[PDB]
Design an enzyme around this catalytic site. Sequence first.
Site, short mmCIF file in Angstrom:
data_model
loop_
_atom_site.label_atom_id
_atom_site.label_comp_id
_atom_site.label_asym_id
_atom_site.label_seq_id
_atom_site.Cartn_x
_atom_site.Cartn_y
_atom_site.Cartn_z
N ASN H 8 26.35 2.70 -6.80
CA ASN H 8 25.66 2.57 -5.53
C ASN H 8 25.24 1.11 -5.36
OD1 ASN H 8 23.52 2.28 -3.63
ND2 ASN H 8 23.23 4.51 -3.66
N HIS H 11 21.18 -1.64 -3.25
CA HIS H 11 20.26 -2.73 -3.56
C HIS H 11 20.77 -4.15 -3.59
CE1 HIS H 11 17.09 0.10 -3.59
NE2 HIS H 11 17.75 0.87 -4.43
N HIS H 44 24.26 4.27 0.79
CA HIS H 44 23.42 5.18 1.54
C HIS H 44 23.01 4.50 2.85
CE1 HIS H 44 19.38 7.67 1.62
NE2 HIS H 44 20.04 7.70 2.77
N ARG H 46 20.65 4.42 5.43
CA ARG H 46 19.28 4.87 5.72
C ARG H 46 19.08 4.91 7.24
NH1 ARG H 46 16.10 6.49 2.37
NH2 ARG H 46 16.01 6.01 0.14
N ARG H 50 17.59 0.09 6.22
CA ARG H 50 16.83 -0.65 5.23
C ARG H 50 17.66 -1.68 4.45
NH1 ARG H 50 13.19 3.09 1.51
NH2 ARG H 50 12.72 3.70 3.67
N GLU H 71 26.20 8.46 1.33
CA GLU H 71 25.00 9.26 1.20
C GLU H 71 24.26 9.11 2.53
OE1 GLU H 71 23.05 7.37 -2.18
OE2 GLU H 71 23.81 8.96 -3.50
N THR H 102 14.48 8.56 -1.62
CA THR H 102 14.83 9.96 -1.87
C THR H 102 13.86 10.67 -2.83
OG1 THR H 102 17.12 9.21 -1.75
CG2 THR H 102 16.73 11.50 -2.36
N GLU H 152 25.16 17.47 -6.29
CA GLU H 152 24.84 16.36 -7.17
C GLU H 152 23.47 16.70 -7.66
OE1 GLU H 152 23.35 11.73 -6.77
OE2 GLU H 152 25.38 12.21 -6.12
N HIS H 192 20.45 9.38 -9.78
CA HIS H 192 19.13 8.96 -9.35
C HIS H 192 18.22 8.82 -10.55
CE1 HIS H 192 16.32 7.81 -6.43
NE2 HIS H 192 15.62 8.93 -6.36
#
Lengths: 242, 242, 242, 242, 242, 242, 242, 242
Positions: H8, H11, H44, H46, H50, H71, H102, H152, H192
Amino acid sequence: AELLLGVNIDHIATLRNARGTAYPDPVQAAFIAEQAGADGITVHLREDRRHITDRDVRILRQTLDTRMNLEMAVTEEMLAIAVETKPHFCCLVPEKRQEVTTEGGLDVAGQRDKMRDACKRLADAGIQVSLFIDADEEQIKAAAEVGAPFIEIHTGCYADAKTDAEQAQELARIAKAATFAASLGLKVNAGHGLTYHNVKAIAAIPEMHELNIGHAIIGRAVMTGLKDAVAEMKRLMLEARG
Amino acid sequence: AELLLGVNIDHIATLRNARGTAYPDPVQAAFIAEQAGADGITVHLREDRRHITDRDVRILRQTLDTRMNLEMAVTEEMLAIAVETKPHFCCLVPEKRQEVTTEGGLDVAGQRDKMRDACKRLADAGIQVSLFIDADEEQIKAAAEVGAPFIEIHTGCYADAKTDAEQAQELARIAKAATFAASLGLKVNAGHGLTYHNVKAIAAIPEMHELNIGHAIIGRAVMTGLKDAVAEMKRLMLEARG
Amino acid sequence: AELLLGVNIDHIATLRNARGTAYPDPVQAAFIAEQAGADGITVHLREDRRHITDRDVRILRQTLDTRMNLEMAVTEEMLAIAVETKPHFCCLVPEKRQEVTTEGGLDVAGQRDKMRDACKRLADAGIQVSLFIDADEEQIKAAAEVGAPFIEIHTGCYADAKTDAEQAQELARIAKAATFAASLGLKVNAGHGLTYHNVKAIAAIPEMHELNIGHAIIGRAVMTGLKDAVAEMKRLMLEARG
Amino acid sequence: AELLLGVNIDHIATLRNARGTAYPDPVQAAFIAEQAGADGITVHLREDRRHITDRDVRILRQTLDTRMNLEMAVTEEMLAIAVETKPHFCCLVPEKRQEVTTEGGLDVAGQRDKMRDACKRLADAGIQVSLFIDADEEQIKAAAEVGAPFIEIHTGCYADAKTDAEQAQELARIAKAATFAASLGLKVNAGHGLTYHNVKAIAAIPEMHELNIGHAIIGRAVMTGLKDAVAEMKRLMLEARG
Amino acid sequence: AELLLGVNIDHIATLRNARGTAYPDPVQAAFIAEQAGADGITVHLREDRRHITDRDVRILRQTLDTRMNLEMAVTEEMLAIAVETKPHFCCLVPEKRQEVTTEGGLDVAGQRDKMRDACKRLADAGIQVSLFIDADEEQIKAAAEVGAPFIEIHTGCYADAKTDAEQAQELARIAKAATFAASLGLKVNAGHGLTYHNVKAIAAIPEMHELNIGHAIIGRAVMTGLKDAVAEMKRLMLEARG
Amino acid sequence: AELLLGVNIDHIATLRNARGTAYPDPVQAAFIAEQAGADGITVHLREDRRHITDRDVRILRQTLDTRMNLEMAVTEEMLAIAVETKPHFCCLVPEKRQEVTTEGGLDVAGQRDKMRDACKRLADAGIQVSLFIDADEEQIKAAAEVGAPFIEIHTGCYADAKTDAEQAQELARIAKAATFAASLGLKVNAGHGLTYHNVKAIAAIPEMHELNIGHAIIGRAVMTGLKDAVAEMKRLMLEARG
Amino acid sequence: AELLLGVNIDHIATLRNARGTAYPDPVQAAFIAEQAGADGITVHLREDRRHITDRDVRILRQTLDTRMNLEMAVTEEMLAIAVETKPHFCCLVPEKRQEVTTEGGLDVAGQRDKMRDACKRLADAGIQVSLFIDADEEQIKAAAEVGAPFIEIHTGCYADAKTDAEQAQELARIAKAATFAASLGLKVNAGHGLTYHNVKAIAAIPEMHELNIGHAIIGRAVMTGLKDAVAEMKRLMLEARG
Amino acid sequence: AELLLGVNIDHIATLRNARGTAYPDPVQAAFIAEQAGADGITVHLREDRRHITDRDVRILRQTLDTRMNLEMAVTEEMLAIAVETKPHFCCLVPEKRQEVTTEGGLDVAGQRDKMRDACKRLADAGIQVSLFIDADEEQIKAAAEVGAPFIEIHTGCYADAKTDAEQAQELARIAKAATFAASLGLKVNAGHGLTYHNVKAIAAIPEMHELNIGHAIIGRAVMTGLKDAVAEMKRLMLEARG
Ligand SMILES: CC(=O)[C@@H](O)[C@H](O)COP(=O)(O)O
Ligand SMILES: CC(=O)[C@@H](O)[C@H](O)COP(=O)(O)O
Ligand SMILES: O=P(O)(O)OC[C@H](O)CO
Ligand SMILES: O=P(O)(O)OC[C@H](O)CO
Ligand SMILES: O=P(O)(O)OC[C@H](O)CO
Ligand SMILES: O=P(O)(O)OC[C@H](O)CO
Ligand SMILES: O=P(O)(O)OC[C@H](O)CO
Ligand SMILES: O=P(O)(O)OC[C@H](O)CO
Ligand SMILES: O=P(O)(O)OC[C@H](O)CO
Ligand SMILES: O=P(O)(O)OC[C@H](O)CO
């Protein structure tokens, strides 16, 4: 025993030939590869000498520390070259002068006498022959009948599968064909279109003797350099068998 | 100020296009280069889209962190593309559909009105134009007369010199042409055929603003990887000026 | 201007011949060096084919990307081989079959006729001749008289000095001999015994055109790898001129 | 436990001795090897001090962090040195003053008394003896009878195999020999001619305790550096056993 | 003449002696250092042998490829050891058995006869002597008067400066003192407490011949490895001189 | 559950404390180690604070990303410090102010009441306690009886073995003792004196949970850097388990 | 001396805080930067503890090997923290609780009393003050009058320049401002928005003492790793001055 | 069989958006990862955009070489975007605009109708749907009933355990839930909160198909670079299955 890797350096010459310069030189790529996981080197001397040239084959034959696997179309020019060159391995492939690359296994079942002649001819010269064919029982029975000791299954359809189901379908056909070929006394290789992301499923197949990979490696090499590209592909292969 | 390096990634696409796969992707090569010494990225959108394609230009325009130098032939298709794309730099070059690569400066003195139109046209769109020409006073006076703010001297003859004397001869002609161009208010670049072994003599030339190098870098990259290939070329350039 | 580095790969071959295997192969060592800071490759064809073989020269000649500097004795066999090979450079050296490694400089002042012919002969074949000589004015004058383009000053005594004073003695002797050689219109190189710890003093001598270094580099190479060995040497050389 | 690697650094010294310089120093190579996969360091003190010297053995004995494996001929000179040097291991080989390298196995069966007293004498000195021999049941039975705790099977013929068939035969011969030796209570090593491409089939043999390799590793090191050279070899070895 | 770097490996032994093991061995550290920018290896034989031992000194003397700089106190024990060892250089320092590290500065002006006889004696053995002193012109004039060819200004106060102003003051002090020393014919070295962040200011002082750095380098080394640590220091040193 | 590695950074501080400087800082060493294969950081707070200090312990407790294993003697000072620090793990060891390093083995069977109250007290603070003991079933049974959830077999005798036989004996001793300990419900760790060449045999013992290694790693680190040293150890450890 | 680099590690923490995890830890990044070209470490303690925390400043203050440069707003909260923390440097910036990042320079000219007492208070605490301002003569004159020893010119506008023309103008504005500030006895830094492609023209300005860079370096580090990220930036900086 | 890694890169974008610059660019991070061990890239989208933006998804979709795992929340906006984008995979997640990241698993058992439609809708568009859920049988049964191909399992509680016992508690809970999910014919992933120190236990769970990891990887990346960060994670994962 250990699954083997045949690195095809054709595309080093593709880059060289685009400009008519001397670099990058396939001869340097061969030393690097042979010291990073390649168990052999493959070059496709195309009739149109698109990439690999006559000097390439001639100099490589003298500098390879392992062995040459000469890929070629079935013609008198090529057979004479192969016989004169005495490569350790010879893989007969189908050729069109202006094709992008290879996409049809070799039609052995349809040219049984031509191939039978080729196989006997090359073997007399001490060359181990491999026929590049499709995961097709008809083509495999033909390769066996004709005398070839090795076949290399075309993994193109698998590599270009457009869906996960389509890919699983092809995988299965390759594995079945591999087992089938072995039952007829043939040793079996595989290659074409193999990448860092789809190689393990093929390497896992037990009957596989050597995988011949080219484009994906050179494609990784421009970014990370040949050494790491070769070692990484070899690692992925050995992982698939452990 | 600091001599600049324009890295031409055309040959990343050459390798990609040879097979019709997605890799290696010019977009990745651009990030690597821009973080290893390239002050800009160059792509030659050939009419025959031999290597760099429309998606390449379109995606690169959005991902380059520095700036695009779009190389192109002088045609309405291309001018419209350049105007729409708004690259920071534009270098007009001579094109034949099936040439190996470029070998004749652009004939500006012979198409003065065509070029005059091109230069005015691109500038209106906010594009800085450079004319790829020979170290020839006739072509240089023409580029100046026509309005182009930059010219890029073709270093091909220098790069292919067959003897040390032949090379010194060409070097001298490039340096004289560089000084000459500058005296007419033009900023001058250079490139084509530049290698790790002949770049310093060109980088030493004071008038040089930016060097556009492609093939030799990609040729080094397959062996050592793009990052080191770019950084090493940049280092050699800065050394020549110190 | 820019000091050049000539890497002698002889000892890659001594390592190979110690066994009669094919590796380590000089041909691989050449590509690495040319890409790590070498501007030319040097190989000495010994009468006893101690390391570099005819095979090596034959392939090297076709694989080098820069240019060959063939060091050899002044004999009819070698002259014939040189004229036939057509190396870019050729360096004439004194040679005894059982010597450990070149004793000193060629005797030019004592064989003005032999050398006069060797030079003209090679020059007719398009080879730039270098006479490996001692930092002795009599020899330099001789070399200039005979017509050689270059001379290579022997740095052996300098490298062998047993005291800081003796070393400094030799240094000034080489520095004066170099200025002298240049004043007679000779281009001047130096080599033999140069190491990572004594090269800078020699590299700092303005008149030096190219330094030829081998053994110390291969000696560093078995520890660190040839690439960093060549690059380090070049780096040190450029700092000395800085 | 795991297959052990004994790194023979003789050829670091052949490079040194080719010039009489102090570098490259075997002492340095030893530290690098021991920290990169070498479980022991091997040196062959030759009659003619061709490479390794009394000086080397004297300093190695004090610097080695692992253990010394002294290879030597069975002569009063060597036995005396061995007894005094007290190396952990001593390997008895056949030797001619001017051979290229060791030719075959020690003739143990036909020199029982000579060997019986040699093993006994070295054992009284606390040295663990290994007799270098051919994959020969007669030589193997004899080795055991003269009391040696170790035998090292000559892998030379396997390495020189001119055809895949010849190679597989030699392989089988060595594996069978190894099984036989073990049945006699002997611990068995193997070595000579092992490379990066033929090492795995030998490492796969269960009875093998330690493999001693030299030239191949040093030949890789001049390109790659000793560290990686040794680590790559240890890597291939453990893979073969996994 | 380039600024030289003397690497003190005392603290390699500090780590070894802390446990009684044989590693890390100062002998290996010396090879790494000499090949990463160290022009000489320095070891301080302490009376309490807390780190460097007689063994170290005895083996290093045979393994150093450059030259040894023996730091010691002026006592009969040491002087006899130095004369027997015959180090290229020898640096006399103040010593107190229970000290953390050298307090700093030999009282030469207060012991001219002792220091005079020491220098003579060491110089008779062919050892170039360095008197470790403070940036004090009285001690400096004395150093010159007693016959020492070298002095090494103590950089400890500069290093331990508590304010930017105090540091500047000590820097200016070391600089003027160095110019004074040079005017007396003394070669001037410096060391003790130098770090990656305060070495440049000292390296920039023209009169400096060699800097002797130890602890800071070993402290960087446990993190990044000795090679990069030596190289990084030398790099900062040469940059300061440019 | 994978074999875990506890890296003791005591000797990072040994180097720091040898001079009074602030570097090398154990805090940085901890981050490197935890990201190179260390599953936990170990520090032995010594009464004489020769290396790790209260500062270290206080900052490490806030910077560790994994968990702290506090080695200490069973005294009031330490127990109070541990309860206040609240390390995830705590290992009680025999301590003598003037020792080189831990002598080895807590006398638990001879001090059941002291060790019983210590464990309780530390467990009340939420600290998992490890009793450092010898491969002695009496001490082991005692360890279990007093309430400790962990014990760490002292590998010092195995490490200092003087003969292959003595080593084998100690290895077999540690192994059987570990099986016994596990049958009592104890989690069993091991450490002290482990090295790159003797860790595998210990790692192969199934009952082992975590190995605590320090000095050997720091000694490798000054040469190659902490990261590669930790990684290399962990790699050998995991290979032994496969 | 040489241009200094202050590395701002705020964004190591934005990554941390985005999740509330403990990693990546600013404390680790600090050690890496200081050993890779950072002469000082910079942190901006924001009103909202968006990234750097009281915890960070508290531990950094004890771990930094160089010096802390605390960036903060001029508020009682921050001044009190500054006075107590005693950082070597303090940089006063303008700040809004919810701004993306610092917007412009501090308004010094229009808040003379506020700033005059702030500089005085921080100076009484022994902190060297730097006022972050625009390349504005009025703000610069004022900075000097309120007694600050340092000013840091906002390079933000230069960084945001939308056209080469706009950029050259901002450049000139900063260079002129820097010259003016210096004439007033101010020491001048610069920062905010500096990247790998715009840093050289700023570093070239003679008056610049230290450059503070953050985001650009951290953005490179996620790809490249912090070490190289910082070293590359320091490299470009020194090149600009050479 | 072979555990896959989904990286992922969210970030990378948070770091970018913290400033509103173009770098670090997710597009570059993708290529690096796909080439370092990632089998697919996860992003993801958002509601508050974000980090990952529509731009990112639009380009990523054309540049990824493997496949996208989008996601997103179950909203009409996202479903519309997903159907339009056609990602290979899509993972439905609970999402609050101002959440840190999340909270837990989707409520499928409580919104069987909403989820039933989302699934069918996406499935019609050719997307393989994964329902991010808690290791709760009620949810798994629900997911199976609704018709999703994958689920998941949330590893957040496992990653957050504050005691070894609490962690083990969660482990078994995930392991049982996974076996359960598989028994209902569901393929199962997890993610996660997975880090370099807690991934192996999760990776060892047989039923796991792919692990999705982001933050811990980017967090390691700012220190070591993304390439080694991804490779390390993958390496750790494969060893756990080994
Ligand atoms: C048949 C096959 O898989 C390839 O080896 C083919 O020969 C590649 O040709 P190019 O290298 O020109 O792509
Ligand atoms: C004009 C020039 O020097 C080159 O940039 C030319 O556009 C290269 O074309 P190829 O990249 O197709 O070799
Ligand atoms: O598609 P490639 O490039 O993997 O080429 C394959 C080998 O030569 C096998 O024929
Ligand atoms: O010959 P190249 O590959 O150096 O290409 C040159 C640049 O694009 C300059 O036009
Ligand atoms: O002394 P070498 O080994 O550096 O040899 C040098 C080259 O042959 C140049 O003469
Ligand atoms: O053939 P070599 O050079 O690899 O070395 C042989 C080993 O020392 C075994 O005896
Ligand atoms: O203070 P050190 O540890 O750097 O070393 C001092 C040098 O050896 C000077 O003699
Ligand atoms: O003997 P060491 O230095 O390896 O370390 C011992 C471990 O910390 C065991 O407690
Ligand atoms: O714009 P930044 O993030 O690089 O950082 C600015 C420096 O800290 C200077 O204030
Ligand atoms: O916790 P992360 O950061 O590993 O995020 C994981 C991916 O989004 C998979 O859910």
